[PDB]
Design an enzyme around this catalytic site. Structure first.
Site, PDB file in Angstrom:
ATOM      1  N   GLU A   1     -11.917   6.144  -5.922  1.00  0.00           N
ATOM      2  CA  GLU A   1     -12.389   5.581  -4.668  1.00  0.00           C
ATOM      3  C   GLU A   1     -11.512   6.090  -3.532  1.00  0.00           C
ATOM      4  OE1 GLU A   1     -10.090   4.132  -6.380  1.00  0.00           O
ATOM      5  OE2 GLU A   1      -8.712   3.921  -4.680  1.00  0.00           O
TER       6      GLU A   1
ATOM      7  N   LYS B   1      -0.280   9.834  -1.352  1.00  0.00           N
ATOM      8  CA  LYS B   1      -1.236   9.659  -2.441  1.00  0.00           C
ATOM      9  C   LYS B   1      -1.048  10.691  -3.545  1.00  0.00           C
ATOM     10  CE  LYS B   1      -3.288   6.261  -0.388  1.00  0.00           C
ATOM     11  NZ  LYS B   1      -3.406   4.873  -0.918  1.00  0.00           N
TER      12      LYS B   1
ATOM     13  N   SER C   1       3.763   7.552   6.012  1.00  0.00           N
ATOM     14  CA  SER C   1       2.987   7.755   4.793  1.00  0.00           C
ATOM     15  C   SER C   1       2.094   8.991   4.865  1.00  0.00           C
ATOM     16  CB  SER C   1       2.153   6.507   4.492  1.00  0.00           C
ATOM     17  OG  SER C   1       1.283   6.192   5.565  1.00  0.00           O
TER      18      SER C   1
HETATM   19  C1  LIG Z   1      -7.058   4.284   1.229  1.00  0.00           C
HETATM   20  C2  LIG Z   1      -6.496   5.455   1.063  1.00  0.00           C
HETATM   21  N1  LIG Z   1      -5.479   5.651   1.875  1.00  0.00           N
HETATM   22  C3  LIG Z   1      -4.710   4.544   2.398  1.00  0.00           C
HETATM   23  C4  LIG Z   1      -3.469   4.995   3.130  1.00  0.00           C
HETATM   24  C5  LIG Z   1      -2.351   4.047   3.346  1.00  0.00           C
HETATM   25  C6  LIG Z   1      -2.452   2.635   2.813  1.00  0.00           C
HETATM   26  O1  LIG Z   1      -2.402   2.763   1.392  1.00  0.00           O
HETATM   27  P1  LIG Z   1      -1.373   1.925   0.491  1.00  0.00           P
HETATM   28  O2  LIG Z   1      -1.961   1.979  -0.900  1.00  0.00           O
HETATM   29  O3  LIG Z   1      -1.344   0.562   1.142  1.00  0.00           O
HETATM   30  O4  LIG Z   1      -0.085   2.701   0.629  1.00  0.00           O
HETATM   31  C7  LIG Z   1      -1.210   4.472   4.022  1.00  0.00           C
HETATM   32  N2  LIG Z   1      -1.079   5.721   4.504  1.00  0.00           N
HETATM   33  C8  LIG Z   1      -2.034   6.673   4.370  1.00  0.00           C
HETATM   34  C9  LIG Z   1      -1.805   8.049   4.936  1.00  0.00           C
HETATM   35  C10 LIG Z   1      -3.304   6.366   3.665  1.00  0.00           C
HETATM   36  O5  LIG Z   1      -4.272   7.311   3.523  1.00  0.00           O
HETATM   37  C11 LIG Z   1      -7.491   6.470   0.799  1.00  0.00           C
HETATM   38  O6  LIG Z   1      -7.589   7.441   1.577  1.00  0.00           O
HETATM   39  O7  LIG Z   1      -8.211   6.362  -0.212  1.00  0.00           O
END
Ligand SMILES: C=C(NCc1c(COP(=O)(O)O)cnc(C)c1O)C(=O)O
Ligand SMILES: N#C[C@@H]1N[C@@H](CF)[C@H]1c1ccc(-c2c(F)cc(Cl)cc2F)cc1
Ligand SMILES: N#C[C@@H]1N[C@@H](CF)[C@H]1c1ccc(-c2c(F)cc(Cl)cc2F)cc1
Ligand SMILES: C=C(NCc1c(COP(=O)(O)O)cnc(C)c1O)C(=O)O
Ligand SMILES: [Cs+]
Ligand SMILES: [Cs+]
Lengths: 404, 249, 399, 248
Positions: free
Chosen positions: A119, A97, A386
């Site tokens: 959000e 993120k 991720s």
């Molecule tokens: C929704 C958010 N996170 C989703 C998230 C995801 C899914 O988010 P994507 O936008 O699909 O990549 C994958 N991996 C981690 C570590 C995440 O925290 C949030 O914390 O606002």
């Protein structure tokens, strides 16, 4: 240099036709600030001074490049395939993120905004936003579903220590989709001075493209790292899919490689047949939701079906429009992974490699294990790890009987 | 040719008054009670009825209408119940437009929903989350089935988008929103003659008459729901007060 | 290097810092680990495995970041944060653990024990044992298992057994005692993975060697980013691993100040602190001759600190040698001071630090006022503060 | 010429027996009581009295002794109390050594503690956490003040280190620890004629008799502490049973 414009939508934000995926399904009250962001992003995306400011923070502040680890001790459970983990879990704040937040926070300063709202479901985007807003002297307000403030409470406290105000959303399913609805209400009322730092590859134009462009670095790096370590392009690149940012980020560099499979893995919760899931591509249909035209889980009348998953980051009944376009064009396959499958992968990664993944990322690891069996011995599979699972430690401890 | 709501504003402007436009969501508290209340609106002097389609994630709705739409959905309200509400209003002599978020229309079929709405006697469609940039299907169905198309303009609308939104509208233009409201109506009447309705969170006759000075129509929504919660007699009383306010002489 | 001890592990000749103050029952495995380290430290197979893991697994190199929003709070000095907080597991401890874990495997050991105070060394050790397939047992003080409960569950998820030590002060000092008793019994097949630059020879030298990578990276990065060597390099000092690791590359640069900051708790004049150099005296403790907090008869005084990692009454022998030579100064930082730097780093830079590392930043802020505008100060940011979020939220009234 | 405890093991050689070595920590349950109990050991047949210095972090001590020294330190025992106990044992005709960890000696001063230990009548020092490699200060003090130096060997001791440890010992050698005890004693008997004491958690007369068949001295500590905790008469009777077992 910059980045090419081959897979981008049109000036209206539409993928694959002037009335296809994406677009802007927003009220007129938001169109002034959306156009202002579109104009600002178009100007800065080709500015070397902007790309320099972003690369400087990405290198010295967030720790990029992230390494590519070959999890050799996973090979046995993947049909003797070779799993390569793209270690986004080692980024500052603990997930991918931060790549997107740094770009958008830098952009919000270039626009003269003083207030940033966002959000968050898993808390990782919320923490990253509060991180950049503390770094760049911006006021920060994060919206989070009340059910998520409970199962991701570690991130709630991190955001407050960073100076942000956290608001617990009590409407609807009290999860991610309802946090987004409340943040939308905030932007309509404060479009003048506030920047909306959206945290995934969805929403109205320009956000699907802008978020993807800030996560492109994952796939750009991984494509170079995998050729240096395995001596060839991978047989497949996989990632979990909530809104779709981390998937599209690592997918993009490989789109023009015809021999590289791309598989996104969505949350199936208790099971797609149970009605308690978030398998948008498996059990959903096209519709307009959260500012774009894409896939979402919806009943026969068009009402959004509330989603469920043990992962708060994948507990979202919609998906980004570029994934819908790639699904229709046949470039990317999308498969479900259940709660139990993910948690097996979660515990396996801990036991075998010493990496505590995010439960979102565990969906991707579980999908890679299955995919490895299908491809077989020697296949090279890159997985986007991720995020780390420090936020999920209490959830995982209960699951595995380390509490009571 | 002329819009469906053209003659209505023609008659109001001839009576030195504005049109009273009333909103009520279908299925609150239940489907039969809501149809009783929309009929009551026609009986109590409402020139146009905004029949609202309850949506699961209504981003534009305030707290009063949000609670009512959730209750209607819990009761099992359907989109086909909104078409039945229009038939009931057409039967009672009223005039109905439908206010809805776009996804239930897409799920129904844009051409199909337009056909079935006009068959039920509906006169137009208000689209708060559909801008003209994405309304190609709706423009074709609207010209085909002789339905008005009410788009929204906001105090933040650029001159380019405001002129383009007014150009795209038929019937009237919704001016959703202090002096921001009459200044927005002045920008619309600077580029076109289309009637303009003003939603301003009206809850009394004094505020209704205050808007009728510059607007062609007064739009009341939340105050009607809060009144219906108290009961049908309170709704008739409040509508009667508002019907007196939209008149000037 | 020219700063190594003799064959017996003594720094500085007659002073006699270091050595081996352990029972004869441990000498067979201590000499065994020493010989194994001398042999494998010059083995390219071993060095290639360590570099491969530091790069593709640990995340090295850690970046160097100039916290420009702190400058106004550091007398307009230029604070540079060595971001060890970004390593796998989230602290410098993984550097030392990856070296000793590989070494345990080279020695044929099948079981690894370790102490832990803040839980970072425990998590790192549990991490490497999961990676290499070793049996792991982590000794942790009962008080520390409560105030660092996040890292306990991380350790258990990684497949490691955790033993809560309830004797003594129930903190880092007593986990080490029990882990020593474990080694005395099971030395045939157990490697003791020591977490800090203390203990008997070879551990003070070996831990520092595996942490030298911090300072070596820092010395190259500061010259590239600033054009010159820093005016000062500072770190926090519990046992001394993260401080010695960032200091070592700078020992022979005569113009570089070296300042170690130790926990002062509620204040040194209160008897609730862990300021070993400020208030201790030479003595033998936990296998080495160094400084420690001791009463008039030589009994160890129990230490207290809001930070679990600095809550230790001893300190590594090489630091005692550096303090005696005047190469490094050591100053106290109180709980209040550390927590101010904690919140300041959160609001100014969006970095939630370990409360251990927050001591160094608090000391850096004071040192910036002393050196003036334009002065370059490199700070070892030893770890991130996910383990401390609950402690800090209670401190600032966010519950 | 000879060690201080040399004549003691010779007297045990002529009487066809091993020596009884009794350990008690100073100040448990308090200083007057511990000194009273240590004198009782001499009247009950203990040849050598190990006087223990309570330490705050005793790594080599089992739970019976560790919790007894913790209670002594809570009561406020000082190092000077141990020297006061040695003088009491010497006046009562006993023969006392001091078993201590090394940091209390460093704090006192190695030379100063040796001088004061000898003046109280002490005969030697047992150093469980001091190996010969670090005993340069202690070797010089041991020669100057005519004190025996008792180092510990272990079953894991390498042959080179065992010979080095024995060569550095005066008085006797503490064989700290199946067949582990006699095998270790045999390895010591094969490089020197110095007496060997054996500590093996002795509890009964039969256990003390089995050890005296190969060791020159039997070391009892935990069982004496456990006895003193029940009562001073229990220690007297248990010491009596131990005094009989060493003569078989
Ligand atoms: C929704 C958010 N996170 C989703 C998230 C995801 C899914 O988010 P994507 O936008 O699909 O990549 C994958 N991996 C981690 C570590 C995440 O925290 C949030 O914390 O606002
Ligand atoms: N009308 C209306 C809708 N209620 C929901 C859609 F169905 C609400 C809505 C509209 C827009 C969005 C949006 C978003 F998700 C991200 C960004 Cl960056 C910008 C946005 F504007 C979100 C929810
Ligand atoms: N005897 C005795 C002593 N009680 C304390 C010292 F005073 C106890 C002790 C001895 C040794 C150690 C030790 C250690 F800390 C680290 C390593 Cl790697 C190896 C060790 F052997 C620790 C405590
Ligand atoms: C005690 C251990 N940590 C000490 C520590 C220290 C102090 O330890 P040194 O060995 O002095 O570097 C500094 N920073 C962090 C983040 C730490 O966790 C431990 O995790 O067991
Ligand atoms: Cs999804
Ligand atoms: Cs210390």
């Amino acid at each position: 240099i910059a980045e090419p414009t081959s897979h981008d939508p049109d000036s209206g934000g539409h993928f694959g036709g002037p009335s296809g995926w994406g677009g802007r399904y927003v009220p007129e009250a938001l169109m002034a600030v959306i156009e202002e962001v579109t104009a600002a992003y178009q100007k800065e995306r080709v500015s070397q001074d902007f790309l320099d400011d972003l690369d400087r923070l990405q290198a010295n502040y967030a720790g990029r490049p992230s390494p590519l680890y070959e999890a050799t001790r996973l090979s046995q459970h993947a049909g003797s395939a070779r799993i390569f983990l793209k270690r986004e879990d080692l980024n500052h704040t603990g997930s991918h993120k931060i790549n997107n937040v740094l770009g958008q926070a830098l952009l919000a300063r270039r626009m003269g905004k003083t207030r940033v709202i966002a959000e968050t479901g898993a808390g990782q985007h919320g923490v990253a936003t509060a991180t950049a807003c503390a770094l760049l002297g911006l006021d920060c307000v994060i919206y989070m579903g009340g059910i998520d403030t409970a199962r991701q409470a570690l991130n709630v406290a991190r955001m407050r220590l960073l100076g942000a105000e956290v608001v617990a959303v009590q409407t609807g399913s009290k999860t991610l989709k309802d946090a987004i609805n409340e943040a939308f209400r905030d932007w309509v009322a404060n479009a003048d001075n506030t920047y909306y730092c959206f945290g995934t590859a969805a929403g109205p134009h320009p956000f699907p493209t802008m978020v993807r462009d800030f996560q492109r670095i994952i796939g750009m790096e991984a494509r170079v790292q995998i050729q240096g370590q395995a001596g060839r392009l991978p047989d497949a690149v996989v990632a979990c899919v909530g809104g779709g940012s981390n998937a599209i980020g690592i997918f993009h560099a490989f789109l023009d490689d015809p021999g590289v499979r791309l598989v996104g893995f969505e949350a199936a919760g208790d099971g797609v047949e149970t009605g308690r899931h978030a398998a948008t591509f498996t059990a959903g249909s096209p519709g307009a939701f959260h500012g774009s035209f894409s896939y979402l889980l919806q009943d026969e009348d068009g009402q959004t079906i509330e989603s469920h998953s043990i992962s708060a980051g994948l507990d979202y009944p919609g998906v980004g429009p570029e994934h819908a376009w790639l699904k229709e064009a046949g470039r990317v396959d999308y498969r479900p992974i259940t709660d139990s499958e993910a948690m097996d992968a979660f515990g396996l990664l801990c036991r075998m490699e010493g990496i505590i993944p995010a439960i979102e990322s565990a969906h991707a690891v579980a999908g890679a294990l299955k995919l490895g069996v299908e491809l077989g011995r020697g296949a090279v599979i890159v997985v986007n790890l991720s995020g780390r699972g420090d936020k999920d430690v209490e959830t995982a401890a209960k699951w595995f009987g380390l509490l009571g | 040719e002329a819009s469906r709501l053209g003659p209505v504003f023609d008659s109001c402007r001839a009576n030195n008054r504005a049109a009273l436009i009333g909103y009520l969501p279908t299925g609150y508290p239940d489907v039969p009670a809501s149809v009783a209340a929309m009929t009551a609106l026609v009986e109590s002097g409402c020139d146009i009825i905004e029949v609202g389609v309850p949506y699961s994630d209504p981003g534009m709705d305030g707290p009063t209408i949000a609670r009512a739409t959730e209750a209607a959905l819990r009761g099992g309200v359907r989109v086909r119940d909104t078409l039945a509400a229009v038939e009931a209003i057409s039967i009672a002599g009223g005039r109905a437009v439908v206010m809805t978020y776009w996804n239930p229309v897409l799920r129904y079929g844009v051409d199909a929903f337009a056909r079935d709405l006009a068959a039920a006697g509906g006169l137009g469609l208000i689209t708060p989350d559909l801008i003209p940039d994405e309304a190609q299907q709706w423009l074709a169905a609207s010209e085909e089935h002789r339905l008005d198309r009410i788009f929204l303009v906001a105090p933040s609308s650029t001159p380019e988008r405001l002129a383009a939104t007014v150009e795209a509208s038929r019937g009237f233009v919704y001016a959703a929103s202090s002096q921001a409201a009459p200044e927005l109506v002045g920008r619309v009447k600077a580029v076109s003659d289309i009637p303009v309705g003003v939603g301003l969170g009206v809850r009394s006759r004094a505020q209704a008459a205050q808007i009728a000075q510059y607007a062609d129509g007064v739009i009341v929504g939340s105050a009607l729901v809060t009144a219906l919660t108290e009961g049908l007699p309170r709704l008739r009383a409040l509508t009667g007060e508002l019907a007196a306010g939209v008149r000037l002489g």
